[model samples]
Target: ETITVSTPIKQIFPDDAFAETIKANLKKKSVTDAVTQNELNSIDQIIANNSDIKSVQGIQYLPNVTKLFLNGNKLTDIKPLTNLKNLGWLFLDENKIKDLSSLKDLKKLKSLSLEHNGISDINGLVHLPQLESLYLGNNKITDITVLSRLTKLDTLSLEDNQISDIVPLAGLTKLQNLYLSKNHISDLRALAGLKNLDVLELFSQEC
Candidate 1:
């Protein structure tokens, strides 16, 4: 797969230290610098030029991709991404990302959209400090313990996830908005702790 995407980190990240680190590490691991640079620039270009590329499924690479869209790809384990570091956004709707433990490496991630997956634990996302918006609708999440630590979060969407307990959100006081529609939660207690919250959507129709 020839990647023609030009997603230069110099355009988004102020200093090239982060991007340079990626290049250096790739080269150290025996990856040719030419291949790395070409993949970064060219693959991004292809995604930008072609609108019909989303149809291509299952770990199609532009290994240098910072934005990965795997929505509806039927992926269960995210084992293919051992080298993805600078990723910012990931879309994994209608798939089978049950064990996202490998996804912790995406530390720089900001937003994640994962609807209709079979995810049960959200603890994997606890370490992602930079994560701002989260979409986890239509999953089977029971433990929200990880969501407590993510104070920098701006938006959190957990609708249709059938979450019964929500005490984990107490630590997320800095959150701006939260969406919990269609869950099995009984009380709106979790939303009250977030004093900085502005917009909140809750549906307690089912307890």
Candidate 2:
């Protein structure tokens, strides 16, 4: 029921903004102030959106993190987040991430948002069966056969990608709200089987 590893100890964050935000969240005096792993674990949510963080350098030390928000940053490599196994929701929208294969093992995730990134390979996503709300708009995804395994998804966003075929989506019967615009898809027959889908956005335009 608790993490036996990642014991309580003062841990230093390399990125200035990453460290400063954590210090602010924990009410520490300064970025140079002492911080402990236990202190970081005491907080469930770590909201660091719109900050100048380039990397989540040492956050892997805290394995108990439940919800993490790192949107609107310049992060290119997110390999550091591969180990935070306790996550429930993770948002990393509007970053420069191109590869996210490390997320294959975080099976506990319920809601995941990686919108507006450069991610093209989502082979890792096929393993996350617990996901319900998956947001993947404005990326470079071309092949979505990997998404067919996520049968539990209720809401999905795949706008502004290079996907031409929607045949892979027919397998997901649990979908409620689906967004597919700005892509090369021309077939709606794949969607005919979705009886639960109530809201479907297929218009092509910017929002």
Candidate 3:
């Protein structure tokens, strides 16, 4: 069966880059009409790292994809990624995504890296209980507010934000390698409960 290349009737605007990627990857440039569902199923991964890309309207059609790298793009909205329930590895660093509440449906996520962005709130992270390593450096978050690492988190790298507290991190008892540099941390007593901590990295605020 063939699939039409059209965004949702009442959804976000199309960025056009997604269609281009699909076309280029599948060598379907001559069609100039629509793509087939069988062709979409053949694509297991997509590397859409172009910085000019802003929307993910066409991505909703590729729900079976597992590995995707969209780093260094102009993407600020990730609501379309929720359709990929089989996604495990994701990298969307160096972009501008403030509200991460859109990616809660991908329960199979393991490693997530969002290094540089404008994410000030991480409360949505509690939904994924299967995370292992998290890289959240150079964001716009101020509070250190967090929830139970609840499953199996071993490494956490959070540098250059504006966090001034560590009470929220205490619940991550399964946490091992912790990296915290810069920000406004004035206390370290809240981390006394952590016994699995072996590698702790920290640096000064500034000069």
lDDT winner between candidates 2 and 3: 2
Model 3 lDDT per residue over 13-110, tens place: 25666656666667765325455666677777888786467876656667678888888888888888877888888888988887778767778888
Residue-pair clashes per candidate: 12, 0, 0
lDDT, residue 67, candidate 3: 83
C-alpha lDDT score of every prediction, in listed order: 0.64, 0.83, 0.74
- C-alpha TM-scores of all predictions: 0.70, 0.90, 0.83
The residue ranges of model 1 lying beyond 4 angstroms of the native Cα positions read 1-41, 45-63
Per-residue lDDT over 104-203 for candidate 2, one digit per residue giving the tens place of the 0 to 100 score: 7788899999999887888878779889999999998989998888999999999889888889899899999999988877778999999999999888
Q: Which rank order by TM-score, best down to worst?
A: 2, 3, 1
The numbered model that scores best in TM-score is 2
The residue pairs that clash in candidate 3, if any, are: none
Comparison by lDDT, 1 against 2, better one: 2
Q: lDDT of model 1 at residue 78?
A: 67
Alpha-carbon RMSD of each model: 9.7, 3.5, 3.8
Could you tell me which 10 consecutive residues in candidate 1 have the lowest summed lDDT? 45-54
- For residue 199, model 1's alpha carbon misses the true position, in angstroms, by 2.4
Model 1 Cα lDDT, one tens digit per residue, 81-175: 54467677888787777667767778878988888887887777766778898899888887788887777788888887778888888778778
